[PDB]
Each structure stands twice: as structure tokens, then as C-alpha cells.
Design a protein around this ligand. Structure first.
Ligand SMILES: COCCCCC1(CNC(=O)[C@@H]2CNC[C@H](NS(=O)(=O)c3ccc(C)cc3)C2)c2ccccc2Oc2ccccc21
Ligand SMILES: *[C@@H]1O[C@H](CO)[C@@H](O)[C@H](O)[C@H]1NC(C)=O
Length: 335
């Protein structure tokens, strides 16, 4: 069933690395800062039942079921794994408000939240924008529950991520916002339903296709901060850039940031090009300082990986539309 409704969520941009919006859980609503993640399908927030020995729980908003008149108990144990850390807790049900839409949703109350990395988290929880296939406990994802209401003009959702005092970004549920893109969308069909993953035809450093020559996978992840490849791919890429590997990143000398070549991603029919301005955190131009890149090595395990991931580095240049009706991803140049 389709309606006429489009709904939007204003996002906050934290240092070009974290983009999050707000949701309300319960009656009266308890508000949480959440990441809208196409790379996962579970909704979770920290719990009032999290032990204060977890320092992260001291530093974030906690859902208290005892203050909500609409809460429905479940209790099923749940463990959720991410790139940087793992959370564990139990399932609960309550009303969730996302941009004006009110939906009865099953979500996990997190009772184990490690200080590393959750102390670095500016957001409280996560809202999974993926398919039921990737959902732990085979729990209906929020978008599937929103589609079921028959209010949305279309079964699509769009992402706009700004460059670091105005709008941090925007999510549109049931459409796209033309104020944030230029030209026309170019679509790429998903390899298979269940994942927001597409086929990538090659990666060039300069003009020459130095990587992904025999084809590779690309996960379009709104919950990822960077553009990521396997340890091997990123080693070749960085060697070509003249970047040196540290513990958590690669760096160049700040003076050599503007001289770095363009990086292109062959997706569907087109070439998606990023200049050094799009992938270097250009904090200065000093010969005496090191500058980080917005491209990181990430070994994404099977069945999803080995795969590349196109996170916020890519979405900042290319406004992204996720089409649930036709199992495809659309890109247009972001305004
Ligand atoms: C663009 O804004 C996103 C900002 C949030 C990113 C970010 C980091 N990004 C992430 O975790 C990614 C979010 N999207 C799903 C992805 N899963 S995966 O399939 O690629 C994968 C799964 C397991 C392993 C071992 C490796 C890869 C991991 C985050 C996102 C969602 C959930 C938790 C989370 O933790 C933290 C904790 C601290 C700091 C950043 C994060
Ligand atoms: C928890 O939710 C699932 C559906 O996700 C349901 O089938 C199950 O019976 C629930 N468990 C309890 C104890 O309510």
C-alpha cells in the first residue's frame, strides 16, 4: 500500500565522521541521538538496566521501560557486532517516532556497551536501515514496519550528508529532496536482495584502473564514516598515494594533501570521482604535520565481505537514494 507522505529527519554532522538524527521511544517519548545505518537492520539504544560499571552507559541517554506506558516486554537475548565494537542486551517493544511517523517497533535494550569504542560515540544508539535477512533475531526492521502502514508516497529513502553552521544532513523517508542534488539519478541494481550491496567494475588512482580490475563488491553503508577496502586493496591504494600506515589510519604530510590524485569508482554505467579535497582531512598545509585520509582498511567478514564499503566520504559528494521497490541504489551529485 502507498500513500502520499514523505517524512524527513534532520541530521547532525559530528566532525565529518558521525551523522545522527533523533528518535523518540515510549509514552511520553524518551529521545535518543541515533545513526541511520544501511549496513545493519537492528534498532538499539542503551538501557536503564545497563550497569554503571560500563562507563559508556554513564555517558549516554538510557531507555527506561518503567517510565513508558506503551512498553511491551520481550526479553530475548541479543548480541550485535559492528566494525569497531559489539553490544549485547535484550529485546523490547515500544512506539518509535521518526520524523513525524509513529511506528510500533521491536528494538534491543543494550546492557553491555564497551567504553572502547562507545565512549567516542556522540550518538546513543543505532537505527538499522537494512533488510530483514541481516537482522539479528529475524526482527522486522523499522522501514519494513513503516512500509506496512501504507503512508509513504514511495518505498524509497534518501541520504544527504553535508560537509562539516547549518544542516548536518537529511534523511527523506518515501522520496528524495531535490534541494540537495543536481542532475539525474543513475541507478545500480543490487546483486541480491537482503543487502544494500552493488557490483563495482573498478577503482582507479589517477586515470589508470590500478584496482578492482576483475570486478568487486561495494556495500553502500550510511553507518560507515569512510570509504573502505580490504587490508590488501588499501595497501596498494595507499602505496600509490604515498601515504604511511599508523595504528588506526593512514597519513600524508599536510603539505602533500592537495597534490594527491583523484580516486574513481566505476559503478553501473558511470565513474564516481573524488579529488583529494573529498578524501583528505586537510587540517593545515604544514610540512611539519600529518594529515589523515577519509579512506581506511576494513576486512568485512563473510557472507557480506570481502567487500568495499562506500560510507560518508562517498555520500558527501553523491546524494544517495535506496529503492526498496526495485532493489537498486541511485546516485546524483550532492548540492
Ligand atoms: C556516518 O555516520 C556513522 C557514524 C557511526 C559509525 C560507527 C562505526 N561503523 C560501523 O560499525 C559499521 C556500521 N555499518 C554496518 C557495518 N557492518 S559491516 O558489515 O561492515 C562489519 C561488521 C562486523 C565487522 C567486525 C566488520 C564490518 C559496521 C557505528 C555505526 C553503527 C553501529 C555502531 C557503530 O560503532 C561506532 C562507535 C564509535 C564510533 C563510530 C561507530
Ligand atoms: C519476542 O518477539 C518475537 C517476535 O520478534 C515473538 O515471536 C516472541 O514470542 C516474543 N517473546 C516473548 C517472550 O514475548
Amino acid at each position: 500500500t502507498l500513500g502520499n507522505t514523505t517524512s524527513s529527519v534532520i541530521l547532525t554532522n559530528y566532525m565529518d565522521t558521525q551523522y545522527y538524527g533523533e528518535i523518540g521511544i515510549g509514552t511520553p517519548p524518551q529521545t535518543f541521538k541515533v545513526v541511520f545505518d544501511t549496513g545493519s537492520s537492528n534498532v538499539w539504544v542503551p538501557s536503564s538496566k545497563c550497569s554503571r560499571l560500563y562507563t559508556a552507559c554513564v555517558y549516554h541517554k538510557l531507555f527506561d521501560a518503567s517510565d513508558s506506558s506503551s512498553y511491551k516486554h520481550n526479553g530475548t537475548e541479543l548480541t550485535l557486532r559492528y566494525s569497531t565494537g559489539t553490544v549485547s542486551g535484550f529485546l523490547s517493544q515500544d512506539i518509535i517516532t521518526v520524523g513525524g511517523i509513529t511506528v510500533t517497533q521491536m528494538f534491543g535494550e543494550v546492557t553491555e556497551m564497551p567504553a572502547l569504542p562507545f565512549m567516542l560515540a556522540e550518538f546513543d544508539g543505532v537505527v538499522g536501515m537494512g533488510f530483514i535477512e541481516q537482522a539479528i533475531g529475524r526482527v522486522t526492521p523499522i522501514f519494513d514496519n513503516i512500509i506496512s502502514q501504507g503512508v509513504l508516497k514511495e518505498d524509497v529513502f534518501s541520504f544527504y550528508y553535508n560537509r562539516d553552521q547549518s544542516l548536518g544532513g537529511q534523511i527523506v523517508l518515501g522520496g528524495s529532496d531535490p534541494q540537495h542534488y543536481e542532475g539525474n539519478f543513475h541507478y545500480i541494481n543490487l546483486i541480491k536482495t537482503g543487502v544494500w550491496q552493488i557490483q563495482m567494475k573498478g577503482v582507479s588512482v589517477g586515470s589508470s584502473t590500478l584496482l578492482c580490475e576483475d570486478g568487486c563488491l561495494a556495500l553502500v553503508d550510511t553507518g560507515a564514516s569512510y570509504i573502505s577496502g580490504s587490508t590488501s586493496s588499501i595497501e596498494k591504494l595507499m602505496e600509490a598515494l604515498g601515504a604511511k600506515k599508523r595504528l588506526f589510519d593512514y597519513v600524508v604530510k599536510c603539505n602533500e594533501g592537495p597534490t594527491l590524485p583523484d580516486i574513481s569508482f566505476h559503478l553501473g554505467g558511470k565513474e564516481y570521482t573524488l579529488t583529494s579535497a573529498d578524501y583528505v582531512f586537510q587540517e593545515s598545509y604544514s610540512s611539519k604535520k600529518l594529515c589523515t585520509l577519509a579512506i581506511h582498511a576494513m576486512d568485512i567478514p563473510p557472507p557480506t565481505g570481502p567487500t568495499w564499503a562506500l560510507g560518508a566520504t562517498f555520500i558527501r559528494k553523491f546524494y544517495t537514494e535506496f529503492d526498496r521497490r526495485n532493489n537498486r541504489i541511485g546516485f546524483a551529485l550532492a548540492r
